[PDB]
Nucleic acid binder design. Structure first.
Ligand SMILES: *P(=O)(O)OCC(C)(C)[C@@H](O)C(=O)NCCC(=O)NCCS
Lengths: 50, 135, 50, 72, 134
DNA sequence: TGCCGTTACAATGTAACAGTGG
DNA sequence: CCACTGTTACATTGTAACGGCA
């Protein structure tokens, strides 16, 4: 029974890996963008919190 | 409807598709006369920065042949554009040798599932073997 | 001179407003979904660890 | 190598300079990474080496030196 | 050398490739000045139906950085042209969902095999399992 | 090395099927 | 029924990277 449950565990592990990678890539791209907008166009002009 | 339809994007896609087809030499126009076809093409070229009028140009001079290919290409382009956002929704293109593809396709129609599903079942059986070896 | 300055002002206004509208919206969209994905991934992570 | 992949991850997940990220550079004060930024940094470190870390032991890591120490 | 190279065919391929690239906006020529580039491109356009002179045109006006890409494109074109004659030598192209592709490639790098070799081995093992049970 | 085959992709286009809603 | 949409399975062409070989 425990091995059967561990199979589902591994499935959930793969799911979590997918999501973690997606988020990590999003953050990497976002950081690159931030480094590219050091020109001061980001502080309010890009970041219209509205 | 699962994919949001964007007018100013699909219109540009359509204009680019028409221009590509014409420059490929195909008769996008429905006109057999050379002069009317040339005039319609010239106007379409002018319509570069006005994708909105491209729909009207379509309704006025588009060749009746192209409706199916148009609605197919733009539908697929929309699907691909929305899927490319995330990796887990992306697609990977691979090439297979004829014997291998023949066996794989035969197996898939036997199991009545898509190629990806058949590969999933196969790799899952191999990984199940690995797991039972591990436990 | 009046005509030229009016045209210039109008062009500047339009270009700036439209560029900001075009860019900031996608920027905010991405920020929002990255936040949401992080939130989801944390729940997945906690369940996995347990 | 691991000791420079760690810098690669930290710099490109926090956007700070490679020169800035030294062994003793703390994330929050030196690199400026806040709660979510540090969370993303640890997630990226996990992803880089395809490993997992306990929650408490991971949060205990709050510096480049500690990061490498747990990685190696 | 496995595939014999034919001039009237490969030269037409090269002319078509260069024309396509030019239509795509690629700078075919090495001339920064627009006039010389346009003149050379017009010469190329009117140079259609000529292998022995399109080769010379390439030698004289071709952009240095596209030589490798053109060479590998022609290699691939030649190989595909010779392989597309027979069924067993043809290649079937498919699209795989990203998770499935990731796992399959994981297996292939792990085992050092190619996608074809890895899938062949896996199917063979599946067949062997069928035979064990049957 | 310089060419040459070979693989693993990418990008786009199509046909065909399956769904969906009016 | 009917139309439009989503999806799969290809094709088609191009490219970069390996690795073999004179
Ligand atoms: P930052 O100030 O936004 O803080 C983020 C966070 C540290 C609160 C967050 O990343 C986090 O760790 N959330 C989950 C906390 C936890 O241990 N929950 C149990 C498993 S759901």
């Amino acid at each position: 029974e425990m091995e059967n449950v561990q199979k589902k565990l591994r499935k959930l592990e793969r799911d979590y890996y997918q999501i973690r990678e997606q988020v990590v890539s999003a953050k990497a791209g976002w950081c690159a963008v931030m480094r590219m907008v050091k020109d001061n166009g980001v502080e309010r002009r890009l970041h219209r919190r509205e | 409807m699962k994919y949001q339809q964007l007018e100013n994007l699909e219109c540009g896609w359509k204009w680019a598709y028409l221009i590509r087809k014409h420059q490929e030499g195909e008769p996008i126009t429905k006109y057999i006369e050379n002069s009317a076809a040339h005039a319609a093409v010239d106007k379409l070229i002018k319509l570069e920065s006005e994708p909105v009028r491209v729909l009207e140009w379509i309704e006025q001079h588009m060749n009746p042949d192209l409706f199916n290919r148009m609605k197919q290409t733009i539908r697929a382009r929309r699907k691909r554009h929305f899927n490319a956002e995330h990796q887990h929704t992306r697609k990977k293109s691979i090439d297979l040798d004829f014997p291998v593809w023949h066996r794989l396709s035969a197996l898939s129609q036997r199991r009545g599932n898509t190629l990806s599903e058949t590969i999933v079942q196969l790799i899952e059986d191999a990984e199940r073997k690995e797991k039972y070896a591990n436990q | 001179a009046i005509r030229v300055t009016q045209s210039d002002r109008d062009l500047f206004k339009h270009l700036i407003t439209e560029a900001t509208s075009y860019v900031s919206a996608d920027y905010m969209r991405h920020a929002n979904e990255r936040r949401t994905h992080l939130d989801e991934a944390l729940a997945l992570r906690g369940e996995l660890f347990g | 190598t691991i000791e420079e992949r760690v810098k690669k991850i930290i710099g490109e997940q926090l956007g700070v300079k490679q020169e800035e990220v030294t062994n003793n550079a703390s994330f929050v004060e030196d690199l400026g990474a806040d709660s979510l930024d540090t969370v993303e940094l640890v997630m990226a470190l996990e992803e880089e080496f395809d490993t997992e870390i306990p929650d408490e032991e991971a949060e205990k890591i709050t510096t480049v030196q500690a990061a490498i120490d747990y990685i190696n």
